[PDB]
């Protein structure tokens, strides 16, 4: 007869189509909520600074918890202690970038590889651009371009990370499942800095590029991305 | 059914409408528009009737055939492309032809054809320029224009009209149309002093003349 098989498979296809549409609405509203949270976070610091100034006191901003690190020096001539930490930071090729959370261990690691790296505090726009353009995902120890949300969902679904917006949200505002998401993200292959480096060998404090460029790292990313 | 209607969403930018999904839902008024639920021919033969089959099996099969290509979406044929013109080209302007046999001469521009080319024509009494097509890229447009909004070009000439046929011979209709358009263009250009002589003259580069510095 096949009259019931045809309608059954049509119902099954319609069911999964409805499920996909429900998921699309879910990620849309989650993105809206993340936008609202971003607005609240941005305005809160300004408001707290304003209320401290009007009272005469000071407001120390929260010390940054997320940093972006770029390997600016080549393979040749590297101390074994330095290169081991570079491997642990997944910075093998020159101009390779990654996100690292800040703690006592991380800061010491950045200090011990200070001459060979340039690290700073990226902002929301930098994270968005890096993830959308240069952001790939390590799927089955391969390098797959993140052209769809299912690629992120199949690997990070168990961490309540279903879309790229959730991934960016955790990367910016470090959550509980930050390590899995960061390890999923392949190291970023950034191009040479347009306009040129001021000085590679010297520290950024003494006019170079290497070192802790606190908020100036965004300028570097805008031209390296 | 119902009469087809235009889109209810004004275009904000390319691919983005001015009204959201819920607002457009209200505009469509979908809240009250819910819905729910060949190969053989008989032919008499003087015998009986024969069942003739159209689209018969191929008589020949090649040794091998190429596989079918994949499917793309944005690769539209040239007949339905969208055509654009430079901001300095308006009907009634003066153009400089640089490539064709009429190179270096100043010509009067009429309108944009359906083939994307510029329908240009100078007074044949002035610079020997018939009703001729020309390419937008291969033409320099100057800052000297005349108001031809009161003229009427014949509507029977198109890309097919100007398409090459196959020694070349001039048809009578070409001369008739050229005279018809000259009788409307030449008196208009003669209003502007020293314009006929400028059109008769040609464009050339001397020593110290540099296109980047000079403005036309």
């Amino acid at each position: 007869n096949f009259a019931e098989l045809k309608i059954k498979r049509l119902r099954k296809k319609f069911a999964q189509k409805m499920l996909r549409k429900a998921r699309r609405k879910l990620i849309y509203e989650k993105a809206k909520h993340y936008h609202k949270e971003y607005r609240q976070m941005y305005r809160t610091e300004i408001r707290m600074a304003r209320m401290a100034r009007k009272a005469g006191n000071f407001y120390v901003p929260a010390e940054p918890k997320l940093a972006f690190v770029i390997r600016i020096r080549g393979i040749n001539g590297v101390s074994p202690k330095v290169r081991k930490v570079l491997q642990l930071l997944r910075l093998r090729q020159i101009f390779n970038g990654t996100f690292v959370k800040l703690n006592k261990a991380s800061i010491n690691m950045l200090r011990i590889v200070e001459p060979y790296i340039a690290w700073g505090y990226p902002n929301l726009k930098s994270v968005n651009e890096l993830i959308y353009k240069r952001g790939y995902g390590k799927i089955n120890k391969k390098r797959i371009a993140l052209t769809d949300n299912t690629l992120i969902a199949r690997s990070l679904g168990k961490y309540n990370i279903i879309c790229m917006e959730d991934l960016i949200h955790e990367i910016y505002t470090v959550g509980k499942h930050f390590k899995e998401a960061n390890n999923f993200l392949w190291p970023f292959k950034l191009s040479s800095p347009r306009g040129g480096m001021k000085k590679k060998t010297t520290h950024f404090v003494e006019g170079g590029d290497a070192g802790n460029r606190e908020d100036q790292i965004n300028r570097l990313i805008r031209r390296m991305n | 059914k119902g009469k087809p209607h235009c889109s209810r969403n004004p275009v904000l930018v390319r691919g983005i409408g001015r009204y959201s999904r819920s607002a457009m839902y209200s505009r469509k008024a979908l809240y009250k528009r819910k819905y729910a639920a060949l190969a053989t021919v008989t032919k008499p033969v003087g015998g009986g009737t024969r069942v003739v089959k159209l689209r018969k099996m191929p008589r020949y099969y090649p040794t091998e055939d190429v596989p079918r290509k994949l499917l793309s979406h944005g690769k539209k044929p040239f007949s339905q492309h969208v055509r654009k013109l430079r901001a300095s080209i308006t009907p009634g302007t003066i153009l400089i032809i640089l490539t064709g046999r009429h190179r270096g001469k100043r010509v009067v521009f009429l309108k944009q054809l359906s083939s994307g080319l510029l329908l240009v024509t100078g007074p044949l009494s002035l610079n020997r320029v018939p009703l001729r097509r020309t390419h937008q890229k291969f033409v320099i447009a100057t800052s000297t224009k005349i108001d031809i909004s009161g003229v009427k070009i014949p509507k029977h000439l198109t890309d097919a009209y100007f398409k090459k046929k196959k020694k070349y011979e001039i048809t009578e209709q070409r001369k008739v149309d050229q005279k018809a358009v000259d009788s409307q263009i030449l008196p208009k250009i003669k209003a502007v002093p020293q314009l006929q002589g400028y059109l008769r003259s040609v464009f050339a580069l001397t020593n110290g003349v540099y296109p980047h510095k000079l403005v036309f």
Partner: peptide
């Protein structure tokens, strides 16, 4: 609703709602 196992009835009802 988006969860497959626990959202089946909700997706069924919204499907009926579209009809």
């Amino acid at each position: 609703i988006a969860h497959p196992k626990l959202g089946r009835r909700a997706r069924a009802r919204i499907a009926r709602g579209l009809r």
